[model samples]
Every structure is written in structure tokens, then in C-alpha cells.
Target: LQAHQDIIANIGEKLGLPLTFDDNNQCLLLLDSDIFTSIEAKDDIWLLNGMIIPLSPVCGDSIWRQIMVINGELAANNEGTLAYIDAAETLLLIHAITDLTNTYHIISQLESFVNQQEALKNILQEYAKV
Candidate 1:
């Protein structure tokens, strides 16, 4: 509890915003009106989840293969993992942190996660046109 509280407190202070989770130990990180990611605090890990892109008419073998290739690269590089959320019909990117000590480190990880999401989104956009 203290671990998550310390990290969460520092994050809001660093970002100059008031951040707090509801009764559910979860909160949404936001920029303007857009959601950047959803932060969830567990017993020993922090899970950062964000939507990469929507899957619908845009999905097929080509896009699936591309996503798998990207996932492979991420696995090799020890970056965040990707998955398709069937209920949401969206591609979700999840980043996990076991050591929640430094607020800067958390911010950096989230930034990197967002960067990967943007790259995936760009790749998906190309497939969407077809």
C-alpha cells in the first residue's frame, strides 16, 4: 500500500495534477480529454494498460502478422506486451513494473509504452485503408 501510494503521490506532484484512484485501486491517466493509459495497482506490481488500436474491419492476416512481428520484437527487447481484448475489440498494450520505487522511472516507462502504441497505431492505420 505504501509503495503504490508513494509512487502515485509523486506522479501527481511531478505532473502537476491531482491523481487518485477510486475505490477500485485503478485510475486513468489523461491528457486533456484523451486517455493516455489506465493505471492499476496490485499487491506487488503496477499494470499500465492502454488501447493501441481498434480491431474490426481493419483486421486480417496482414495486420495480424504485422502485430505478431511487432510483438516478437517487443519480446526480444523486453518491452511491453500486446494483446487483443476480445470484449473491447481493441488491441491493448500492457506494461508492468515490479519495482515501483522511482517516479521518474515509472514516467519513462509510460512514455516508452506510449511511443510503442503510436508506432503500432501508425502501422494499423495503413492497414485500415484497405
Candidate 2:
């Protein structure tokens, strides 16, 4: 883990960006504007403005598998119950907020990802068990 961090720090320095770690040990790096814009153009993935937030490279594979399992469970368990829908919606909202918060911390910036966020919340709010 230390070695991985060292490599990342070295690369970040070479790219003339600042890198740090969050409380959760997530890697937070400031990205050069040109590099940031280029990546954003190709990847729809959200990042804090000018901040490149990367999950620890070491846990990348494991985290992908875990997310697949969790998302699959959520999809398969859909029963159209108001309670269940509400719960699921609440979870998504939490996810969106957490995502945005991480981006904000890394970039020291903000933007409106709210329309989609609120739509998910409203769908859950109106959900009824059928």
C-alpha cells in the first residue's frame, strides 16, 4: 500500500499536480486543467472540478466486484413496494450526495448535479407497493 501511494505521489508530482489522502485513505489529486478536460471529455465519470479522485488502485478490482454484487442485489430485489422503493431511493440519494461531496472536497468546487438527483428522490417518494 505504501509503495502504491509512493508511485501515485511521484506520478502526480511529475504531472505538476498536488496529491493527498482523505480520512478514508482515498487518493485526492489536483489535475492540470488540460489533462482534466481531456479525461472529462472521454469519460462521463464525475470528478471534483480540477480534482482527480481515484479509489485506491490496490482495491480497484475488489471494489468493482463488490459494487457489482450490491447493484445486482438491489436490482433483483425490486418488488415495487412503496417502502422498498423509498428505501432504495434514499440509498441512491445518499450515494449521489456522497459522490458530489467527495468531488467537492477534492476540487474545492461545486456544480448542479441536482436534477437527476432529485428525480431519483421523487420517484422513490411516489413509489407504492403494487
Candidate 3:
């Protein structure tokens, strides 16, 4: 493994996530079917930054759009990750800074994003119960 790969492995391990070096994807991945995402890189360079905010869509079109809008507004408010609703992957993506040292910060942001996602889902479910 090269420097970046080693760093990737070390960081992923520290995160205590089931991580793997996916050479084909050119990154370290916590890939476990629908419950996974990638810490994407390219040729040892942190592509666009040090992290990737990847999600698997699990909501309807309108709800998904609401999620995107909420997230986008949060980002604009300087709160959440800078992300775009990715139609191709049927997910949303956000990239962090170019320094791997901020790995923990990146993970914190991911945690917050997912927490918000879960909250919204719960709210939507309650709304449906009416």
C-alpha cells in the first residue's frame, strides 16, 4: 500500500468501521450493501477532499426532494455538508477538505447528516400514520 492507502486504512480502522481498500473504486470503502459508502480517492490524492458523503436513496421522489432541499438549505446556512442530490447514484454526495488530518471532523459531519436523515424519516412516517 502507498502512503495514501496506508493513511486511508489507518483512518478507516480508527473509525472502527468495516473498511476495505477497493482498488477498483480507487478508495477505501465501508461497503456493506445498502449500509455502506466510500472514502473516495484517486491515485493516492484525496479527490476533491478527504471524504465522500455517500447515501443510498430510500425515500420517495417527493420526500427525497424534501430531504435534498432541507440539506441544501442547511448547507447554505453553513451548517451541513456541501452536497448535491446525485440522481445517477440515486444518492447525495459531499466532499470534505483536502487534508486527511480532519478525518474525525469529516466523520462527525457524516454522523450529523445521517442523524438528520433519520429524524426526517421518522417524521415522515408519523405523518403517514395520520
Residue 45 lDDT (model 1) = 92
Q: Candidate 1: list runs displaced more than 4 Å.
A: 32-35, 127-130
Model 3, position 38, has a per-residue lDDT of 46
Model 1 lDDT per residue over 38-106, tens place:
889988899888766667644778778878898888888778888888866777888787777778888
**What is the lDDT, from 0 to 100, of the residue 53 in candidate 3?**
34
Error of 3 at 55 (Å): 12
10 residues in a row with least lDDT, candidate 2: 34-43
> Candidate 3's residue-wise lDDT over 11-111, tens digit each?
66877754545656454333233323345555534432112233445546775576667677757754444344556333334444355566686566556
- In model 2, which regions exceed 4 Å deviation? 29-130
> What's the best-to-worst order under lDDT?
1, 3, 2
Please give the lDDT score at residue 85 for candidate 2.
Answer: 25
Give the Cα error of residue 106 in candidate 1, in Å.
1.3
